[PDB]
Ligand binder design. Sequence first.
Ligand SMILES: [Br-]
Ligand SMILES: [Ca+2]
Ligand SMILES: [Ca+2]
Length: 329
Amino acid sequence: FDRQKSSFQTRFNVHREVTPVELPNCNLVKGIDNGSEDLEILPNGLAFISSGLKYSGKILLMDLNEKEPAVSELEIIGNTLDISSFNPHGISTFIDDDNTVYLLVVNHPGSSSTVEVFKFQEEEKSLLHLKTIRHKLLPSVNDIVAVGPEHFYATNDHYFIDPYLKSWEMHLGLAWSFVTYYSPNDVRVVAEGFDFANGINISPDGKYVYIAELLAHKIHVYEKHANWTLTPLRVLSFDTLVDNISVDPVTGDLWVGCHPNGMRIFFYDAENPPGSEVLRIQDILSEEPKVTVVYAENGTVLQGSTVAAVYKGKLLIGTVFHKALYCDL
Ligand SMILES: [Br-]
Ligand SMILES: [Ca+2]
Ligand SMILES: [Ca+2]
């Protein structure tokens, strides 16, 4: 009809501008200049950050207990991973009954997807690679949430693997993006038909799963059952493209990094760079969830926020290809 221009304008939110919401005392994290697309903070205040996403790659570490925490690059060791193609994207952590910390990392060596499993060796500041996971039901993985050392839910932001086909898929509005449950002897699709499923996380009691649908501007809440299956419970809508979801383990609150305007993030223009926006969502099961814009700007400081998490009154914000911001709430 040429109501395809209309679908494009709403999916990519092409008219949105950003009302500023300032915080006291924000500082750029020195040494992060090429992306910090996803990050996860352990209960002890150690923060993992994936960087150098292309569409060289590193996992960074900050100790948020420090007054002015510096970043260091974690050393990856092992012979089961080829670091020369390491291209990390979403991450997740899992802490076993023995306090072993596992880090799961979405990796895009070339056009493909894998999920890399590491064991974090705290004293050594290093990651011991353990396993490379790949599967037909993980064609185009964006993020995962770990529920065991090699067990996770994964979003696929596209159905296709080939970037040319992905591009058609996205622009055609097929909405074939889907979510997969992966475990050693049980891999299945758990929800499907998304327009660019992206962020994913879980409530601290393991009973609910949250899935960001980037181009629909939605967060889906699902009940998670004892048999690992998901059923739809509710859908929240926003005026922003929602990217990664972090969950505060104390409250269960969601902290979501967002892209107010889709044009600016998908078609990068240094003269009109993407801005940043962080939402907090409280009481997500109640009749009126409380949604607060905690931080928002047009990118004169931080461009393309994807993720945000809090730790003891500090907010750490990452981006797809730019810097990271550390703020007092
Ligand atoms: Br923007
Ligand atoms: Ca993640
Ligand atoms: Ca993401």
